[PDB]
Amino acid sequence: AKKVNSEFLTLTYGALVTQMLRDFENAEDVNKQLERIGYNMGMRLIEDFLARTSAPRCLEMRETADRIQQAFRIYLNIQPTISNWSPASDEFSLVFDSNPLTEFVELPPDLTNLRYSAILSGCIRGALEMVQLEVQCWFVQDQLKGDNVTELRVKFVRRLEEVIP
Amino acid sequence: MAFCIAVIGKDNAPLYLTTSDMEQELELQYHVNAALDVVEEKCLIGKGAPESKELYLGLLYSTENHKIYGFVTNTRVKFIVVIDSSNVALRENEVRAIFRNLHLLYTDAICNPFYIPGESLTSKKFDRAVQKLMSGTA
Amino acid sequence: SEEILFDCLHAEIVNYCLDSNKEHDLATLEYIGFTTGYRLIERLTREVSRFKDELETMKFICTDFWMLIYKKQVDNLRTNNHGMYVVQDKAFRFLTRISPGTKQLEHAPKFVAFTCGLVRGALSNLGINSTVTAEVQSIPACKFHIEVNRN
Amino acid sequence: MKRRDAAMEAYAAMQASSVAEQQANMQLCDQERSYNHSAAIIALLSQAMAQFKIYKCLRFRKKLAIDMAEEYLKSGDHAKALTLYSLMLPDYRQEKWTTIFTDVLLKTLRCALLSGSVADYIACSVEALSLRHQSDQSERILILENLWQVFQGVPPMPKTQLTPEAQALWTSALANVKSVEMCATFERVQLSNDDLLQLQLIVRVLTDIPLRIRSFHVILADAGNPQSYYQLFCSTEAQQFHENTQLRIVRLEAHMGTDQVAALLTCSSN
């Protein structure tokens, strides 16, 4: 009893993905819904992550990597391992052996372009812009699409700054 | 040691592959094996074949070279492997473990959101799950 | 603190409701969820022998399922003779975060669907059947009004 | 049954050649030839079926009944076999075990063709049509063309599969014998004071091989007052009657290629 309290979440997510996918025929449309809904979710989650980890704020991508992988530790109980840094330290890679949020959602649904981790991408970006870090997010490798490890990618695009006092 | 796997829905059978440890089940009883089940129900059902317990059925049904061991969940799913060995030195303990494994593999195929419950098991993954079960415990 | 994910996610579902249907929410969440909980319920109080059929009040199984998910106990459990009955609960988790003042009442059907959509059992009152309506008068106080799939 | 089989090869070995005690074996062969009646199988399965019913058992009685029917076929008395099969299809169809259902269906068609019971033949054939995706396509086509043949009187082509006696059987028949899954689509039930309704039902065909497009009829439902997709010009309803009117279709009257389905998958209300 209760190895995982929140295995509930992944099934809810599967419900949402199939509900949209029935609603909107295109993998692209649901991609935008996943991204924006991750955006709002990550906006919700980053403040709690900073209430617990109580980080100063991220002024350096090594710090950003440690912070977000710590959040994965504390939110999805996963241990992504930072790797593949940019020479300019913009890119780094998060090694998910098991995408926690999927437990054989479907290996073939007969649908490429349907990317699952887009919810993570939305969460990471919305979180980051709460802390004034506009970084784009995508997924270099993804088990479901035929890979062996699911690998998120983020590259430091711009340093947002508070303005207009 | 032919394990005619057969999950059953409320009434009908979602997946019932014909596999074992070595290779496919040649013997041509398959559809009439399911007919063995439709006599395991409507007859050997009694008031008992459905229960509200994780169902140990040590030989709810037996016959030559063909021994049925059953299981039922609160969701009324019928889980049945057949001991197709007049006898081999395997004792019911590993059979209980096997119904644990089959429970878990079936319900993790259930973990799919795409697959509507009550339909033929599409998952080649849940396939290989059953396949490893057969290759191991047969 | 794994709940925060689900609180936020259900919150955003409370947000978007497209006008095509009120509840686009199908129940596969409920189906696969009770199957999961019952993977954790690899033991429930029903006798080893198959013939002697004992029914488990899905009221009680609902209590336990809340402890597995909703974590807080169902309180006031009034029941008619037949499959129709109700739960009266003073506190509901998703409505614990809303102001207790009876002003935000609409947000219930997303709540009550989640307790529907759980496969039945042949023997009635066996613990798993589900088809449920809600009438949340007071905010924390959900009122899940049950109707069995049968009479 | 094993004994009858054993008798089969006992014969066979007796044809091999036939110096001490061998004549005794010969009289043995003859005596077991007397035993070739094998109606004892029928009696034993009779008792088995009764006893199985005694403990509320349906399928063992159902499976031993299929054994009875198959031995009737070996008995040649295909009539009783088709009687059994006729009783045994409904329960299989309710049971939904898609493996066994077609497996008994092919035998049931065999009995229908040998018997020449063209009515049961066409009914089981059209139910096979409705979902015949498990079997090979060309076989579905041959079934359909044989069906059209027999609706308009032409004998089926498997002439080598048929025998002159059965030819007589079904040439004799049809004197009394008279009269793919698709959907009924009503645009407007609960009629108001003034309206009209045209061809809105959609005849989906699950079979690959197309149903030949010649004709069709719908009989105006008496509910209240008495009155690859193919969409066409039939469009029966063009008049006015009293309101609060509902409709419900008995059978297709499927005059597309065939004359009528004779099997009730023409759902009234889905």
TrEMBL record, chain A:
The keyword Lipoprotein does not apply. Its main location: endoplasmic reticulum. Keywords: Endoplasmic reticulum, ER-Golgi transport, Golgi apparatus, Transport. InterPro entries: Bet3 (IPR016721), NO_sig/Golgi_transp_ligand-bd (IPR024096), TRAPP_component (IPR007194). GO terms for cellular component: cis-Golgi network membrane; cytoplasm; cytosol; endoplasmic reticulum; Golgi apparatus; TRAPP complex; TRAPPII protein complex; TRAPPIII protein complex. Belongs to the TRAPP small subunits family. BET3 subfamily. This is Trafficking protein particle complex subunit. It comes from Drosophila melanogaster (Fruit fly). The gene is Bet3.
UniProtKB/TrEMBL annotation, chain B:
GO terms for biological process: endoplasmic reticulum to Golgi vesicle-mediated transport; Golgi vesicle transport. One of its GO terms (cellular component) is TRAPP complex. InterPro entries: Longin-like_dom_sf, Sedlin, TRAPPC2L. Its main location: cytoplasm. Keywords: ER-Golgi transport, Transport. It comes from the Eukaryota. Belongs to the TRAPP small subunits family. Sedlin subfamily. PANTHER family: TRAFFICKING PROTEIN PARTICLE COMPLEX SUBUNIT 2 (PTHR12403). This is Trafficking protein particle complex subunit 2-like protein. The gene is Dmel\CG9067.
Automatic annotation (TrEMBL), chain C:
Component of a transport protein particle (TRAPP) complex that may function in specific stages of inter-organelle traffic. Specifically involved in the early development of neural circuitry, likely by controlling the frequency and amplitude of intracellular calcium transients implicated in the regulation of neuron differentiation and survival. Keywords: Endoplasmic reticulum, Golgi apparatus, Neurogenesis. Pfam families: TRAPP. It comes from Drosophila melanogaster. Belongs to the TRAPP small subunits family. BET3 subfamily. It is found in: Endoplasmic reticulum; Golgi apparatus, cis-Golgi network. InterPro entries: NO_sig/Golgi_transp_ligand-bd (IPR024096), TRAPP_component (IPR007194), TRAPPC6/Trs33 (IPR037992). One of its GO terms (cellular component) is TRAPP complex. This is Trafficking protein particle complex subunit 6B. GO terms for biological process: endoplasmic reticulum to Golgi vesicle-mediated transport; Golgi vesicle transport; nervous system development; vesicle-mediated transport. The gene is Trs33. SUPFAM superfamilies: Ligand-binding domain in the NO signalling and Golgi transport. Its main location: endoplasmic reticulum.
TrEMBL record, chain D:
This is Trafficking protein particle complex subunit 11. The keyword rRNA-binding does not apply. Its main location: Golgi. Keywords: ER-Golgi transport, Golgi apparatus, Transport. Belongs to the TRAPPC11 family. GO terms for biological process: Golgi vesicle transport; long-term memory; protein secretion. Involved in endoplasmic reticulum to Golgi apparatus trafficking at a very early stage. The lineage of its organism: Eukaryota, Metazoa, Ecdysozoa, Arthropoda, Hexapoda.
